């Protein structure tokens, strides 16, 4: 790789799971599935929402949200009383 057309990074901290190094790698903040991933090239500290496990798409099917309540409500509504 040439010398002078390659930018770089900082900011800031590494992990608490492995040996306490920073392998030029990530540090991923989430809440749903709090994995402190040191899996990311550019800069570690990042305040994100998903870990590809929140939603039922990357991991695969997940009953992560309902996403059912609409159907049953009106059904028993016009099941009992409507229209």
């Amino acid at each position: 790789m040439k010398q002078g057309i390659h930018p770089e990074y900082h900011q800031v901290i590494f992990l608490d799971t492995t040996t306490n190094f920073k392998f030029l790698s990530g540090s991923t903040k989430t809440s749903s599935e709090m994995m402190e991933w040191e899996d990311g090239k550019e800069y570690p500290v990042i305040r994100l929402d998903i870990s590809s496990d929140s939603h039922p798409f990357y991991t695969g099917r997940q009953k992560f949200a309902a996403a059912d309540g609409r159907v049953e409500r009106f059904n028993k509504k016009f099941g009992l009383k409507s229209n």
């Binding site: 790698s25 899996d39 990311g40 090239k41 998903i50 870990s51 590809s52 798409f57």
Partner: peptide, 20 residues
């Protein structure tokens, strides 16, 4: 293998990303 680090970069559920 930089590539092999980019491949993890999928976290890109933006608005309605349900169509892989």
């Amino acid at each position: 293998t930089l590539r092999g680090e980019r491949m993890y970069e999928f976290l890109d559920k933006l608005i309605s990303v349900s169509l892989p």
